[PDB]
Design an enzyme around this catalytic site. Structure first.
Site, PDB file in Angstrom:
ATOM      1  N   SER A 107       1.014  -3.061  -0.155  1.00 23.81           N
ATOM      2  CA  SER A 107       1.869  -1.840  -0.745  1.00 23.81           C
ATOM      3  C   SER A 107       1.629  -1.142  -1.986  1.00 23.81           C
ATOM      4  O   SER A 107       0.433  -0.638  -1.930  1.00 23.81           O
ATOM      5  CB  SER A 107       3.296  -2.685  -0.790  1.00 23.81           C
ATOM      6  OG  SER A 107       4.280  -1.696  -0.820  1.00 23.81           O
ATOM      7  N   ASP A 189       5.352   0.993  10.499  1.00 19.53           N
ATOM      8  CA  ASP A 189       5.889   0.569   9.112  1.00 19.53           C
ATOM      9  C   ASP A 189       7.153   1.267   8.763  1.00 19.53           C
ATOM     10  O   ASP A 189       7.295   2.236   8.993  1.00 19.53           O
ATOM     11  CB  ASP A 189       4.681   0.966   8.157  1.00 19.53           C
ATOM     12  CG  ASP A 189       5.035   0.257   6.706  1.00 19.53           C
ATOM     13  OD1 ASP A 189       3.822  -0.144   6.083  1.00 19.53           O
ATOM     14  OD2 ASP A 189       5.751   0.385   6.286  1.00 19.53           O
ATOM     15  N   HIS A 226       6.155  -3.548   7.195  1.00 20.48           N
ATOM     16  CA  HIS A 226       5.396  -3.312   6.147  1.00 20.48           C
ATOM     17  C   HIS A 226       4.832  -4.585   5.596  1.00 20.48           C
ATOM     18  O   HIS A 226       3.921  -4.994   5.215  1.00 20.48           O
ATOM     19  CB  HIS A 226       6.456  -2.907   5.180  1.00 20.48           C
ATOM     20  CG  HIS A 226       5.691  -2.509   3.924  1.00 20.48           C
ATOM     21  ND1 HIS A 226       4.849  -1.382   3.797  1.00 20.48           N
ATOM     22  CD2 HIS A 226       6.050  -2.660   2.590  1.00 20.48           C
ATOM     23  CE1 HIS A 226       4.257  -1.143   2.632  1.00 20.48           C
ATOM     24  NE2 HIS A 226       5.029  -1.872   1.924  1.00 20.48           N
TER      25      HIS A 226
END
Length: 319
Positions: A107, A189, A226
């Site tokens: 991330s 995502d 994600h």
């Protein structure tokens, strides 16, 4: 259009504070064999991001896992989080016998790595590759800073589409890879969009990087979110390829349709698999209890010239 050059910008944090945020498993960062530096996502520490995944998986590939945990839970100004990474690379490079080391991220950690490479020239010769899972170099169009509360964490302002931070990264040259980079991401995502085009339009894409959209390999209907972008067995095969590759990037020959397993990596213990599926749990309480403000943090002086005209807390960015 050359990247920023010359001396490294000054650190805003004391070096002792930066050192306090770096840990290696079973070793000191100043005397460590084959370190890999793990950079966590928003709302987590290093262990919270990687305990269920790349800490054990990198150790099994022969690395010493090391990580940074910029306080509080990666919610502070991304420019300050990058100081932790730059100081860690300096330390681990020397600490491993003056040898380049890989950086692996999740991330926000990806943008942190690329921001550091863009604006801190000293570390470019100390990082041999970047393996970024679900990075958001362009700033997501989802979950903005003014959702449900008029105040949001400093890094949430910055990692939003249109932010001064993402504007400066792109204008300084940062959406092209600086060291050999693999970006693994997903069209589905739920934190980072747009990711659907399998093209430079995607937030995770870097020019000249090895840009691996999972659906491009596994099919249009393949679903991984994600966190699954970090933890899945498919992700392990790509990351292992990237870490072993003599080119510094994952190689298409090393993975294929039979690696399209979206569930946690095979080699994780049962405890780790349950933890990996549950990844994203701690970044709820952390956010609610962390710093929040009504404006994007000001750009530090090394980055201000690249986002003249954007608005931050002090007002309009001037050169």
């Amino acid at each position: 259009m050359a990247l920023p050059s010359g001396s490294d910008p000054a650190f805003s944090q004391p070096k002792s504070v930066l050192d306090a945020g770096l840990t290696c498993q079973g070793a000191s960062p100043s005397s460590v064999s084959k370190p890999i530096l793990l950079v966590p996502g928003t709302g987590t520490t290093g262990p919270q991001s990687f305990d269920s995944n790349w800490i054990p998986l990198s150790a099994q590939l022969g690395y010493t896992p090391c990580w940074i945990s910029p306080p509080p839970f990666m919610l502070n100004d991304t420019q300050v989080n990058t100081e932790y990474m730059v100081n860690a690379i300096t330390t681990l490079y020397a600490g491993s016998g003056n040898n380049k080391l890989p950086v692996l991220t999740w991330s926000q950690g990806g943008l942190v790595a690329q921001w550091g490479l863009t604006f801190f020239p000293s570390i470019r010769s100390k990082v041999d590759r970047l393996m970024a899972f679900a990075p958001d170099y362009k700033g997501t169009v989802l979950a903005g800073p003014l959702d449900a509360l008029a105040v949001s964490a400093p890094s949430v302002w910055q990692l939003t589409t249109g932010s001064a931070l993402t504007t400066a990264l792109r204008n300084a040259g940062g959406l092209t890879q600086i060291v050999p980079t693999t970006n693994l991401y997903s069209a589905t995502d739920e934190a980072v969009q747009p990711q659907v085009s399998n093209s430079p339009l995607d937030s995770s894409y870097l020019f000249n990087g090895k840009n691996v959209q999972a659906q491009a390999v596994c099919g249009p209907l393949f679903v991984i979110d994600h966190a699954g972008s970090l933890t899945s067995q498919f992700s392990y095969v790509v990351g292992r390829s990237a870490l072993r590759s003599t080119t510094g990037q994952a190689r298409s020959a090393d993975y294929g349709i039979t690696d399209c397993n979206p569930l946690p990596a095979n080699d994780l213990t049962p405890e780790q698999k349950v933890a990996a599926a549950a990844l994203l749990a701690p970044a709820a309480a952390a956010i609610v209890a962390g710093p929040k403000q009504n404006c994007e943090p000001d750009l530090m002086p090394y980055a201000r010239p690249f986002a003249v005209g954007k608005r931050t807390c002090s007002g309009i960015v001037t050169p």
